[PDB]
Amino acid sequence: SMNKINFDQIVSSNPETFSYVTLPEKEEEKVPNQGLVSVPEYPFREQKEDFTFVSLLTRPEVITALSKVRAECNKVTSMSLFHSSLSKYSRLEEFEQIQSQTFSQVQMFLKDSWISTLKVAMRGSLRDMSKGWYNLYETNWEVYLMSKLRKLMELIKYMLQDTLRFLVQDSLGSFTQFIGDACCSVLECVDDMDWGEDLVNSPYKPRKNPLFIVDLVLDNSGVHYSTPLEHFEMILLNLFDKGILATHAVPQLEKLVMEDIFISGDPLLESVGLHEPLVEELRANITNAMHKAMMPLQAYAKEYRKYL
Amino acid sequence: EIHMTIAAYQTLYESSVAFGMRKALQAEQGKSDMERKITELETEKRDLERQV
Amino acid sequence: KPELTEDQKQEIREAFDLFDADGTGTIDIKELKVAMRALGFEPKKEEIKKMISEIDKEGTGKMNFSDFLTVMTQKMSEKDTKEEILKAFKLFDDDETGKISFKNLKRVAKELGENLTDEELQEMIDEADRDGDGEVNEQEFLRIMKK
Amino acid sequence: TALVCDNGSGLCKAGFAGDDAPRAVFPSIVGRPRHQGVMVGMGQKDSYVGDEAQSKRGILTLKYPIEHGIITNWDDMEKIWHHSFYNELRVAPEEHPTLLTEAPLNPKANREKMTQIMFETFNVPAMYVAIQAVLSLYASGRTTGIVLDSGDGVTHNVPIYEGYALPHAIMRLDLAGRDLTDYLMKILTERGYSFVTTAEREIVRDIKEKLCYVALDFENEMATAASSSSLEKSYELPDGQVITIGNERFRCPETLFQPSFIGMESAGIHETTYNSIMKCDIDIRKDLYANNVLSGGTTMYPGIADRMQKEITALAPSTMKIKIIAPPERKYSVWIGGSILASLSTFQQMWISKQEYDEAGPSIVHRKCF
16 A cells, blocks of 8 residues: 555646656545534424433333343243143143143143242342332332333333233244144045045055044944043043133233232233134134044044944 | 543444454455355265266 | 312323423322412422422322322412412402402303302301401401411 | 444434434345446455445345345345445444344344344444334333334334333334335326336335325325315436426325225225234223324324324224324434433443453343343
């Protein structure tokens, strides 16, 4: 670079002696008449001040608390409310056991572990915020409702409900898709058609290994498997009930989080209910999947009924 | 003011070349991770040879 | 025990929050004194240190909003020297009769905004007219209100 | 000291924190010289970026980085940032905490990747992320708001409550300034001006800034336009040909309310915003009706505030004071918000920082950040 500026100086000085050589380019600048872009007048200082006045972000303690509860949610959001995974086929009672266990485990985890954990962690951060809007040591419901503190807490309520809502949706959707990958092959084609007589051979197979193992019995005026499959359909609907209802039972954060006054009539959190349409249509889809898959078992029993 | 201006120009150059080699060396670490990838995949090709 | 309405609380809230945009939720006892004298009362250093002793064991120099509100409620609560009573009647009377005509009351009611009924207004007139002359003198106002 | 950089997909803005306006603005485009051997022979820099790229748009290759509001290529975006810092801002990036901004619901991996690239390659000690609507509401100066945002490549509505975004009520709509330019191009083609080249298309964008405005009673406005020439407004092209536009000036904006003109089936922006607040909770619905705020380039069109006010009120229950607000600088207002946000000293305490950046590193943009 030094030699560059030497060269440029030399060639500027004595052009004819080496006129064959070009100069480099030359370029210019014009001072942008303001160093800032045009953006017609507005109360920029007043807007900034107002933002500082209203906002809750002037307090690093609440930052530490909120980021902490976010971390708790961030493992929570990648938990599951259901065991959306099975190694191989299973019998009915094992499904009921493992799912009811899963529900109980997540219910204890939320009610004892998650709520207590977030409550004590935020309290610990809140503890040493002294007098001001954020005062844990509130003594009047009216002033608490007046406070930023309540509004922050209600945002915590919003965030943790939102997150558990995501957990509910992702559990239900995944679980249903997992059933779908087994059933979709039979869902393509039944229409009361009998699969054949190729007793060693079946067109209906899950994309992976099957969900269920099925016991066959032959009787005076009967060919049937285990118990007639609808008993399974109802039980799996109750599995839906157990899980979805398990979402409800989370104690409303206010009463544990704020201690320094009586509060009672405390609710739960809100959770996603049993009739939000996306869940209802998943329940429909799984109804189709089981009810239709049960029909080819009828077809196979039909050919067995002559051997009966 | 002009003394600070020249100081700023120097600081700018220094940091700009700092970015330049910091890219170069980040990419060289990336090439070291290529070396890792090829070496470990060669051990995995030994594993595939064992698997055949 | 002293009390003031939720709307009064809201007004006091706007007072507090405008008193400093810094959003601390606490503000200087000096500014509380400026507030009181802006209301019309200039309490003396004995009262300044008395209230400071209420507010700030730690000595932040700051009320929180609940202290500001509660001390406001208390200073609002007590009885005044006769000058303020005269001010009250002089605002209540702009017939300048020394009499609270039912007109005078009704206008004061419309000014303050509470919609209490005409029979209720006339009844508090009638009891406040401690001498039963037809309405309330500043004398009769004194006689009822000092009780 | 701090830096703020922002991308409403359409144009990108670069500014020093706390300033009442950004120090440079330049368009969201990168271009590489088409013969790399010539470039290395020259030493002419890796890419033209910002407006000079437009000046050369034909002489080289050009590409967009943030389509539909989402990162199409990281390496291009980092070249944008490099050009921003050195050419516009001149500062050493290592010496100044830096703010970068994103569309909402960005797929999680993109946040982490973006963080990683900024921290490791650009070498600033501290940086923060924000979602554009959140900064635009900061410029409006509320924690409590429903935002309309439209930079020419995307549009969203966003409820924000005490400074957080309630995720589920967010909706996307893929109907933005580019689409409006294309519809306008189509209808002018029906008039017979037939803009197609990039240069002409830019002229169309200029016409959008110069002469569009919303109708109120659209069908009445259209009828009156048909009735009389008095609504005409004329413009002269750079080549000195004169072009004349009636109904089309308000008709083109209608597509926002009236996406069937685009042949897409989600209801118009007003409807989408109503449906979003319906996803929000009655507890907070009133304040959402109280603070409707418009953000980003498309809000540039005159009068849109009144049209939204009417159409929202109609779709709303007639039981609140609806209030549109269209803060004059609303497109810049996204960056203005960030400038004031970073100005807040406590955000220095929010800073994600190198020491954490080793162990807590890429994940904390998920875990610590908002």
